[PDB]
């Protein structure tokens, strides 16, 4: 009987975490380690890696590694499961063990934004005692050219695999206006169509939209830490009021909108605590 190992991968119970909460430098990743027909007694090694699925297995790329040993005890006895029993005879024994394997949030976003999901999978290896000469909290040494006796090395294993799944942003816009007077204009007032483009800069996604006074329109799906521009076509606005227009870019909640050129404005979307959502208000004033 050769003996197998199994993992199964979890974050807080749960299959997927939010990558893209700022107020965790680590994420922990719970890997419980199943041992098939191990004996008891016996000190077993164990090594966990934690990659990127499309990376999996190439030394040099892991996230995270742990490693420790185990000597196999009757109350890490486990029942088997069906899938267990048909993979390695109705009689196996079970036993199971845990492994943190802690990631560095900036090593999965490199301080950039997240755009996506990030597939991550757990690898592991099982070694018998006696194979290897020094075990460490990352890596197994081998005696010789030994070889672990079991490995469970399947980037697209359900059981391994955790998401590393981002949150996103929005910036909602309103127009208002002040100084709209009649006798200058081409259009009634409340026909008059304020035009803009939000570029989101890292995304790179446009947004055109046209909003009418107290009109509001919402960008959404906006990566956290990406900066937007709003840009108003103000000649179009001034030939619809008969006015020139100084354009006043105004946020909620203390967010910073910067205005260098008149109708253009920058503004952070998820920049202790972040504004995700967040609202901008271009005032058109009009005046002669």
Not at 87 to 95: C, F, L, R, T
Not at 138 to 151: D, F, I, L, Q, R
Not at 158 to 172: D, M, Y
Request: net charge negative; glycine share 8%; aromatic share 6%.
């Amino acid at each position: 009987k050769k003996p197998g190992v199994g993992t199964y991968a979890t974050v807080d119970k749960l299959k997927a975490f939010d990558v893209t909460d700022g107020k965790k430098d680590a994420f922990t990743i719970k890997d419980t380690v199943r041992l098939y027909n191990v004996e008891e007694g016996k000190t077993y090694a164990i090594a966990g890696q934690l990659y990127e699925q499309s990376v999996a297995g190439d030394e040099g790329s892991a996230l995270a590694k742990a490693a420790t040993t185990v000597k196999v005890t009757a109350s890490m006895a486990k029942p088997a499961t069906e899938v267990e029993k048909t993979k390695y005879g109705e009689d196996v024994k079970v036993y199971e063990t845990e492994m943190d394997l802690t990631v560095k949030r900036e090593d999965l976003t490199k301080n950039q934004v997240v755009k996506d999901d990030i597939a991550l999978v757990v690898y592991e290896q099982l070694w018998a005692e006696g194979t290897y000469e020094k075990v460490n909290d990352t890596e197994v040494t081998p005696k010789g050219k030994s070889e672990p006796v079991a490995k469970h090395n399947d980037p697209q294993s359900s059981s391994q695999s955790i998401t590393a799944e981002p949150q996103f942003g929005s910036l909602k816009l309103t127009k208002t206006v002040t100084g709209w007077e009649d006798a200058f204009a081409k259009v009634a007032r409340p026909e008059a169509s304020y035009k803009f483009t939000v570029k989101c800069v890292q995304k790179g996604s446009v947004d055109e939209f046209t909003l009418k006074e107290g009109e509001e329109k919402t960008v959404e799906g906006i990566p956290l830490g990406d900066t937007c521009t709003i840009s108003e076509d103000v000649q179009g606005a001034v030939n619809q009021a008969g006015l020139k227009d100084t354009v006043k870019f105004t946020a909620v909640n203390g967010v910073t909108v910067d205005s260098q050129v008149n109708g253009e404005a920058v503004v952070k979307i998820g920049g202790s605590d972040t504004v995700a959502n967040v609202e901008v208000t271009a005032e058109n004033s009009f005046s002669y």
